[PDB]
Amino acid sequence: GDCPXKPWC
């Protein structure tokens, strides 16, 4: 759920 906005996303 860490997306969007994430580097590993």
Side-chain angles (χ1 to χ4, degrees):
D2 269 332
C3 268
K6 258 354 315 180
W8 60 74
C9 210

